[PDB]
Design a binder for these strands. Structure first.
Length: 94
DNA sequence: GACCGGAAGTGG
DNA sequence: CCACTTCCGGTC
């Protein structure tokens, strides 16, 4: 797979029919996984990695902290916030 | 349990 | 190369 997790989360987030498992909620960029497990099995599907689970996916998100692509929303389960500072950069090619 | 981050490894 | 994937030893 060549798609990126943040890109894929957005894809999902861009249709509200997927709200049964992920949804925008809060200030600009915030969202929460209403079904963390379905999100993971989907990402797994998409990347042909079928042992994907939330514990692994969440690790990948944690890596995004240093990249400023995302922060954790503190004291809110399964909630993160996209940050534009780093998205801007990750949208740039070579 | 959830969340954190180090470390090794992987495959488009 | 690099963004993950896998796994794990810690904090609550």
């Amino acid at each position: 797979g060549q798609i990126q997790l943040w890109q894929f989360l957005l894809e999902l987030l861009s249709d509200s029919s997927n709200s049964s498992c992920i949804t925008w909620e809060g200030t600009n960029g915030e969202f929460k996984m209403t079904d963390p497990d379905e999100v993971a099995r989907r990402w797994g599907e998409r990347k042909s990695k079928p042992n994907m689970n939330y514990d692994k996916l969440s690790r990948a998100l944690r890596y995004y902290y240093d990249k400023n692509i995302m922060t954790k929303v503190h004291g809110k389960r399964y909630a993160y916030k996209f940050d534009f500072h780093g998205i801007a950069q990750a949208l740039q090619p070579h």
